Design a protein around this ligand. Structure first.
Ligand code: YC4
Length: 119
């Protein structure tokens, strides 16, 4: 199943080309700009004291380029931190919270396509 594959099956070189495509799709999305680089503390009081595990798309790109991820779960966990951190720090009427909702929905669509392609 795709769930077990996601947790257990090591990422191959072919898998990594798919991860790069997924990442580039997210970076190009109209609602991705809040997530392209780390949050600046001057945009968000106490951000780094509140958020335990910050993440952003440039950090994920570096990690993809360095072959940091061994399993798809780990890549999904980093991506999900981006959206969960945003929704945790901000109120639901924040424009950043709204971007997280839209971009995660897009991620989920692309992720399902990638999982289907591994077979
Ligand atoms: C509270 N807060 N402040 C900023 C931000 N993104 C920044 C990154 C660079 N340009 C916008 C997010 Cl994602 C957030 O949640």
């Amino acid at each position: 199943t795709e769930d077990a594959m996601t947790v257990l099956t090591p990422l191959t070189e072919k898998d990594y080309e798919g991860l790069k495509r997924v990442l580039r799709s997210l970076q190009a999305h109209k609602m991705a700009w809040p997530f392209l680089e780390p949050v600046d503390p001057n945009d968000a009081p106490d951000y780094y004291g509140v958020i335990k595990e910050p993440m952003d798309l440039a950090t994920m790109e570096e990690r993809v380029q360095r072959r940091y991820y061994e399993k798809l779960t780990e890549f999904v966990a980093d991506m999900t931190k981006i959206f969960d951190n945003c929704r945790y720090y901000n109120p639901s009427d924040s424009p950043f919270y709204q971007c997280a909702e839209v971009l995660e929905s897009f991620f989920v669509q692309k992720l399902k396509g990638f999982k289907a392609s591994r077979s």
